[PDB]
Design an enzyme around this catalytic site. Structure first.
Site, mmCIF file in Angstrom:
data_model
loop_
_atom_site.group_PDB
_atom_site.id
_atom_site.type_symbol
_atom_site.label_atom_id
_atom_site.label_comp_id
_atom_site.label_asym_id
_atom_site.label_seq_id
_atom_site.Cartn_x
_atom_site.Cartn_y
_atom_site.Cartn_z
ATOM 1 N N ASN B 8 0.962 -1.083 0.568
ATOM 2 C CA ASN B 8 -0.121 0.150 -0.248
ATOM 3 C C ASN B 8 0.747 1.579 0.301
ATOM 4 O OD1 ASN B 8 -2.138 1.684 0.317
ATOM 5 N ND2 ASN B 8 -2.757 0.921 2.562
ATOM 6 N N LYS B 10 -0.274 4.213 -0.048
ATOM 7 C CA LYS B 10 -1.014 5.346 0.254
ATOM 8 C C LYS B 10 -0.647 6.547 -0.322
ATOM 9 C CE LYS B 10 -0.227 3.578 4.941
ATOM 10 N NZ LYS B 10 -0.034 3.604 6.426
ATOM 11 N N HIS B 93 -9.831 0.717 4.884
ATOM 12 C CA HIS B 93 -7.930 0.846 5.910
ATOM 13 C C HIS B 93 -8.316 2.373 7.248
ATOM 14 C CE1 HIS B 93 -4.497 2.304 6.568
ATOM 15 N NE2 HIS B 93 -3.702 1.218 5.599
ATOM 16 N N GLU B 95 -6.967 4.899 7.528
ATOM 17 C CA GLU B 95 -7.110 5.839 7.511
ATOM 18 C C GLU B 95 -8.193 6.975 6.989
ATOM 19 O OE1 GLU B 95 -3.531 5.560 5.547
ATOM 20 O OE2 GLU B 95 -2.477 5.397 6.942
ATOM 21 N N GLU B 165 -5.781 -4.424 11.617
ATOM 22 C CA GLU B 165 -4.525 -3.574 11.680
ATOM 23 C C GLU B 165 -4.803 -3.372 13.241
ATOM 24 O OE1 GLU B 165 -4.599 0.229 8.856
ATOM 25 O OE2 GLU B 165 -6.708 -0.460 8.406
ATOM 26 N N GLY B 171 0.685 5.051 15.992
ATOM 27 C CA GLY B 171 1.010 6.501 16.641
ATOM 28 C C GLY B 171 0.771 6.983 18.160
ATOM 29 N N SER B 211 3.279 -2.895 11.663
ATOM 30 C CA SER B 211 3.970 -2.499 10.835
ATOM 31 C C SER B 211 5.190 -3.354 10.277
ATOM 32 C CB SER B 211 5.405 -2.070 11.453
ATOM 33 O OG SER B 211 6.752 -1.543 11.886
#
Ligand code: NA
Ligand code: NA
Ligand code: NA
Ligand code: NA
Lengths: 251, 251
Positions: B8, B10, B93, B95, B165, B171, B211
């Site tokens: 991906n 992104k 996703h 995001e 995910e 973060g 990750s």
């Protein structure tokens, strides 16, 4: 002000072959008068369009994100578009405000980011039926324009076009008149004059973004504060050329 | 199940020249073992990617809308993507769920529309930190998968891949372990088994979408319920090939 006609294909056509056919028709069109023409297409067709469209017109994106790149799956950014030589984007179209829930803060951030990175923008505004019926159209549109104004970087008003969309006339059972178009474009020009000055107000093109077809474009073009159009469905049709050519009726 | 690695990109890279350089590097990569590789890129780079990427891999979109075409300014649709020969899209996703506010109803409609129109999908799910800390990760992910399940048309499970995910590890100051990856992929497989049956559960690839780097891909690949990866930043780097090649550690 040079008359300005943007063709917004929206999410159309369905196939790259159809996009290429549309481009071929546009490339053979005889333009009359003096007019700045921009054609906006889906992201995935922008390369095609940039390669093949007549070079006296310009290509536009239909949206951009607020950042240069990064962890924003699905988004297309200003540098990507610019890397094909594309200089324009639409921002704040009613469909994105209303279906994709884009708010004024997000849109102001897009306008600032696009302009500071060398884009030109077609920034859309317009009121819904409730505000129209309440007699508060100018208040609603003023709030939108007042959120846009501080986003425009110093020196960038030459790269801003504003489109007024009578959202109250989309799928509501009500229709807009030629006089409604003129009145709202004048409202926007007067807001600009009052907030950023007459020089800017006198140079910014303000477009009518309601229903524009070959049967109404000439009368709309003649309105003194209407500087052109952000065209919907007629963009995909030979009648787009009639609309481009309506510039000869605008003084 | 064939091991599956999706890259991906992104919202990257910034320019078409950079996209072409990345493609050249991928085209010279020596793949070991047996693996299905898909590369997802921004819409405006999809034509480039489809033209130039090695034909033993496949191209993917990063999102699609719910309709074939129409008054959806800024959106790209399934038929447009298919008209270039592209067969895959990512959906849901983190995001897009979290920044673009895509909800489960919108995503289910996208999955149904994409599948019924001959796409294959990489459907993403995963819980946030609060649910992880509360010990309710499996409940949260189950609700997401249970919204996806009724969207899948009869006969289309061969065209579905699911990515987990660990949003709680993005973060937040917390990191996921190899065991966390295995445990959540197993949770998803067991939900499938309980709701749509063992045959489907045994064939659907379930990917780890946290990750993934050259320094952890081999140990992750070896986990029995991890069938591959939806790779983030390493997608843009030579280390993507190490990740593709981790399939040799998955039994
Ligand atoms: Na009033
Ligand atoms: Na005029
Ligand atoms: Na629990
Ligand atoms: Na495995």
């Amino acid at each position: 002000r040079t008359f300005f006609v943007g063709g917004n294909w929206k999410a159309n056509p369905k196939t790259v072959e159809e996009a290429e056919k549309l481009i071929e028709m546009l490339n053979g069109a005889k333009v009359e008068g003096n007019v700045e023409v921009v054609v906006a297409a889906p992201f995935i067709f922008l390369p095609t369009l940039q390669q093949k469209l007549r070079k006296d017109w310009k290509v536009s994106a239909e949206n951009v994100f607020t950042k240069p790149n990064g962890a924003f799956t699905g988004e297309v950014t200003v540098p990507m578009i610019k890397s094909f030589g594309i200089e324009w984007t639409i921002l704040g179209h009613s469909e994105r405000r209303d279906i994709l829930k884009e708010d004024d803060e997000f849109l102001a951030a897009k306008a600032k980011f696009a302009l500071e990175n060398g884009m030109k923008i077609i920034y859309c505004c317009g009121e819904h039926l409730s505000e129209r019926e309440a007699g508060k159209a100018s208040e609603f549109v003023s709030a939108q324009i007042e959120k846009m104004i501080p986003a425009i970087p110093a020196g960038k008003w030459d790269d801003v076009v504003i489109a007024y969309e009578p959202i109250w006339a989309i799928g509501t059972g009500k229709v807009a008149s030629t006089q409604d178009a003129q009145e709202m474009c004048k409202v926007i020009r007067d807001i600009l004059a009052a907030k950023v000055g007459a020089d800017i107000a006198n140079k910014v093109r303000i477009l009518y973004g309601g229903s524009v077809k070959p049967n109404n474009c000439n009368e709309l073009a003649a309105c003194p504060d209407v500087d052109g159009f952000l065209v919907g469905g007629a963009s995909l049709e030979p009648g787009f050329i009639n609309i481009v050519n309506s510039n000869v009726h605008s003084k």
